[PDB]
Amino acid sequence: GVDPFERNKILGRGINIGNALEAPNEGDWGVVIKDEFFDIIKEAGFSHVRIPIRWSTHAYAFPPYKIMDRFFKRVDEVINGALKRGLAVVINIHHYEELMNDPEEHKERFLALWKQIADRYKDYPETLFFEILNEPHGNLTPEKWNELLEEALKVIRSIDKKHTIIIGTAEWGGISALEKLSVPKWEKNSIVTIHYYNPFEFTHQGAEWVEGSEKWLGRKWGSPDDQKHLIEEFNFIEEWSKKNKRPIYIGEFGAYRKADLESRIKWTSFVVREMEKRRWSWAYWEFCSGFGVYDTLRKTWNKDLLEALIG
DSSP: OOOHHHHHHHHOEEEEOOSSTTSSSTTTTSOOOOTTHHHHHHHTTOSEEEEOOOGGGGBOSSTTOOBOHHHHHHHHHHHHHHHTTTOEEEEEOOOOHHHHHOHHHHHHHHHHHHHHHHHHHTTSOTTEEEEOOSOOOTTSOHHHHHHHHHHHHHHHHTTOSSSOEEEOOSGGGSSTTGGGOOOOTTOOSEEEEEEOOOSHHHHTTTOTTSTTGGGGTTOOOOOHHHHHHHHHHHHHHHHHHHHHTOOEEEEEOOOOTTSOHHHHHHHHHHHHHHHHHTTOEEEESOSSSTTOSEETTTTEEOHHHHHHHHO
């Protein structure tokens, strides 16, 4: 009889170790998760780490869709590395693109991946959280996601009743389809996650993977209007949280390094203040890459950005 709001409180402040295991091969996008990263993160004050994992590229495409031994092993090493420092850990299925493009064709493989993950970690500590699917979008519409997520809940709950499950929104995981999200009433131990990157043109200016983002380079953030618009979107998330009685986790939020530094600090610091006012848990995107707050080579945090997060 777990209290999902207490689990959310336990999750608390976190950071994403991105551009690592969610790439095709860990290291491909710049980050290889070193076990030493966990000492660095816990010592700076964080409560948890979120670990994006592209399981779909490390499991057979044919039944029984088995996850490859070596990769499962690597994920184990990362999860335990985090747990050894007393960090809570969030794992998910990240970048399963074929599922987004043809959900019915991939549904059973997707559900088979969760049966295997749950099976593997059902006895791990209460501080391990299962995030169903990162940023549903495309043909996996909001309407479809409500049914798919319930099917995922069922496979997981038939194996594990101890761990809190984290459920995102469709249309890329932001607030645009929050209004359409429904979590089944029978499920009692889940947190709803939203990725907050608004204004998108500010946070993703110049991101090489976003078509036409170059046009937003130079954009700043910090006006009272900028702040009021953010407050109104958080008030929208919050009233939805109260009407649906589900805890809130802002699983990603961050501004790309190409954005001018002062704006990045102001935006990050304001978002943190406003999420804390609402008692939400959250995870900064991300630890040491294109949106990084820690330089792993020089072994140094951007102190002001870290201040924004933990201060």
